[PDB]
Nucleic acid binder design. Structure first.
Ligand SMILES: [Mg+2]
Length: 706
RNA sequence: UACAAGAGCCUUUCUGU
RNA sequence: GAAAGGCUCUUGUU
């Protein structure tokens, strides 16, 4: 076991304006009776699940008198069976025989019943309301099996989801593909009661025309995914109506396999009271030092200059696109437009580029870049025109970031031939950040009280190669804020063993980031806020145990008797929690989604632990997915309001756009550093790969990854 | 490879068949 | 269930 438990909730959030919401969680009436856990062993071990459930029903209907009495038990399909009342077998094991036909053959099955444990729903009710510190996971799987018994028979199971055939609304897609509609069904705990999380979904099947229920797994063209996008395009009201109609049609409250366990489910979505946090003010620079107010999570840079602008004296253009497509007229027009746009933004580009020549292939990247470095003293930036996807991008990134230490920016050919003010403005944001300047900062007086002391913000993420591997290693990236502003971040990366979830060398990189912070700000951080991405809920305990100890070890290696407060937050942006507006007057945009800054820490979240949802971004397509934040550790004793406000404001510090993003800036930066390090390994034994992801000394202290 | 966000194919594969 | 990765597509935007 581990000795680090996640902290409980300090309080509930109060700040922000109240918004009425409806989450796709359905209240569950769980009785206090004890249900009984069994296990079924069937030989051989390669039985189909369909005939497994069929022979389970055959035993129930056949051996009714001997064992099963008058009960209807539930089965997950593979191993374990549950019954609401105890079968008269005690600890005994009974071997029975099942006769079945086959595809021209005959099958004889042997089946055994074994008692396992007595799981209690009273203990679950105690754990759901501040009595037991841990929700009993065995009870959760038992309840999930109970509620997914009949969907596994009426519909066709697909993973954890059930898909039914489309009636009337069938999309032919292409060939024999269809648009079979279904839903993900899961059982989640909450402080108030048990919740049935249900989200609507669709996938291709093979009912076709001259056996139905065959899911598509083969390969086809790109037209099918576009047609399925057009068929399944659902805004927030569309998903809300689909899930509500699905729950009204399914009717769990009339299922006999649910009634024997004495369970009621609510047919309506749970009403949850959210709060829309106000956005921070964005302080720009230049002459006016204009202040931008994010309206619906989006602001602009019109009549605004960078907080610190980098004047570009000498720059180069390396066009790897063909001359006949990307001409000199296009390059000159792009240069003039970029110079005027950057002059508007407080980033003056003085004069024409020193170098502007064409090149071909990734083999020419290193000699051309070496010539650029050795010929033009004081060179600040090389613009790389690329003809779409190419290995030239990976070679350029490897040469500029790890080999030569040259700041480079890649632009597609299509964005040079046809320029837009927004593309050039976003480019200028990238250039200003890549050249050492800061675009904007949070308003220092509009920031939470955490910023009144030296505080570093860390973001971590691990990218793993797909399984069936082991020559390809995993990459762990950690970034750290470098001022009280925080908008500039230093990046540290490591290569580690394949498919490893914890960060093995976290202490070394956190030590490097702390050293860089102490160099840049001349102060050690009194508070370390650690945003960790890509950690599953099962891995929470081992990830916390390894990584909190690694952070403490790094702080000790920095200086004796140096133990700053650490907050460990795990970001999960992939889940099935969907939030909708109860009233139409609070829907935002054509997608009708919740406004940016909507935070939920009630009634759908964890019973006894510091966790919350925050939709910091403004959804413009589909239904917004609010990022989930779980506080695995908190030495600083953050209030809920302060932590949520800080998270939202950190989501407002992303430098690549004038937008509020779904996750805070350090987590996004760690993700980008992991992707960049993956690009650095394209040319590729651990020491050869540890040296490959190591960026140049002139590249280490800048935001190459932006 | 201007950027954000949301979905689908598709890929290993734990499998479930 | 998940690594998120590709492949796109959509909304687009100063
Ligand atoms: Mg990642």
């Amino acid at each position: 076991g581990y000795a680090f438990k996640p902290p409980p909730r300090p309080d509930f959030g109060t700040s922000g304006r109240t918004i009425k919401l409806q989450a796709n969680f359905f209240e569950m009436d769980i009785p206090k009776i004890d249900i009984y856990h069994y296990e079924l062993d069937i030989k051989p071990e390669k039985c189909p699940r369909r005939v497994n459930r069929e022979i389970v029903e055959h035993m129930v209907q056949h051996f009714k008198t001997q064992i099963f009495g008058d009960r209807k038990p539930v089965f997950d399909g593979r191993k374990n069976l549950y019954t609401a009342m105890p079968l008269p077998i005690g600890r005994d094991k009974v071997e029975l025989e099942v006769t079945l036909p086959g595809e021209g053959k005959d099958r004889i099955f042997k089946v055994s019943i074994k008692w396992v444990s007595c799981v209690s729903l009273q203990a679950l009710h105690d754990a759901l309301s501040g009595r037991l510190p841990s929700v009993p996971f065995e009870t959760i799987q038992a309840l999930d099996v109970v509620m997914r018994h009949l969907p596994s028979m009426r519909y066709t199971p697909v993973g954890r989801s059930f898909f039914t055939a489309s009636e009337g609304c069938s999309n032919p897609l292409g060939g024999g593909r269809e648009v079979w509609f279904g839903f993900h069904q899961s059982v989640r705990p909450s402080l108030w009661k048990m919740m049935l999380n249900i989200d609507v979904s669709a996938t291709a099947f093979y009912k076709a025309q001259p056996v139905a229920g065959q899911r598509c797994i083969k390969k086809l063209t790109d037209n099918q995914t576009s047609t399925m996008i057009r068929a399944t395009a659902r805004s927030a009201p569309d998903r809300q109506e689909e899930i509500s109609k699905l729950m009204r049609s399914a009717s769990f409250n009339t299922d006999p396999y649910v009634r024997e366990f004495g369970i009621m489910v609510k047919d309506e979505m749970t009403d949850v009271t959210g709060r829309v946090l106000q956005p921070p003010s964005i302080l720009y620079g230049g002459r006016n030092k204009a202040i931008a107010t994010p309206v619906q999570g989006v602001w602009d840079m019109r009549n605004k200059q960078f907080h610190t602008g980098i004047e570009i004296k000498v720059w180069a253009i390396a066009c790897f696109a063909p001359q006949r497509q990307c001409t000199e007229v296009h390059l000159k027009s792009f240069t003039e437009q970029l110079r005027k746009i950057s002059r508007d933004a407080g980033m003056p580009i003085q004069g024409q580029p020193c170098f502007c020549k064409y090149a071909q292939g990734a083999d020419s990247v290193e000699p051309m870049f070496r010539h650029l470095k050795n010929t033009y003293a004081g060179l600040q930036l090389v613009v790389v025109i690329l003809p779409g996807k190419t290995p030239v991008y990976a070679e350029v990134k490897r040469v500029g970031d790890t080999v030569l230490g040259m700041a480079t920016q890649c632009v597609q050919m299509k964005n040079v031939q046809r320029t837009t003010p927004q593309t050039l403005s976003n480019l200028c944001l990238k250039i200003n950040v890549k050249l050492g300047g800061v675009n904007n900062i949070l308003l220092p007086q509009g920031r939470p009280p955490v910023f009144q002391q030296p505080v570093i913000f860390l973001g971590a993420d691990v990218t793993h190669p797909p399984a069936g591997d082991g020559k390809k290693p995993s990459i762990a990236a950690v970034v750290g804020s470098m001022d009280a502003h925080p908008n500039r971040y230093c990046a540290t990366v490591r290569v580690q063993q394949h498919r490893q979830e914890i960060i093995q060398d976290l202490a070394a990189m956190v030590r490097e980031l702390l050293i860089q912070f102490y160099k840049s700000t001349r102060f050690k951080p009194t508070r370390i806020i650690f945003y960790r991405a890509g950690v599953s809920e099962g891995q929470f305990q081992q990830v916390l145990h390894h990584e909190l100890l690694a952070i403490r070890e790094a702080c000790i290696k920095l200086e004796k008797d140096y133990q700053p407060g650490i907050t460990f937050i795990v970001v999960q942006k992939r889940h099935h929690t969907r939030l909708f507006c109860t009233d139409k007057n609070e829907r935002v945009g054509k997608s009708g989604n919740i406004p940016a800054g909507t935070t939920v820490d009630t009634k759908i979240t964890h019973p006894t632990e510091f966790d919350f949802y925050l939709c910091s971004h403004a959804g413009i397509q589909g239904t917004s997915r609010p990022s989930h934040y779980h506080v695995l550790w908190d030495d600083n004793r953050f209030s809920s309001d302060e932590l949520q406000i800080l998270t939202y404001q950190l989501c407002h510090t992303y430098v690549r756009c004038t937008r509020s993003v779904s996750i805070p800036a350090p987590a996004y930066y760690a993700h980008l550093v992991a992707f960049r390090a993956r690009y650095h390994l394209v040319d590729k034994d651990h020491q050869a790969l540890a040296k490959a992801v190591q960026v140049h000394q002139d590249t280490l202290r800048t935001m190459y990854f932006a």
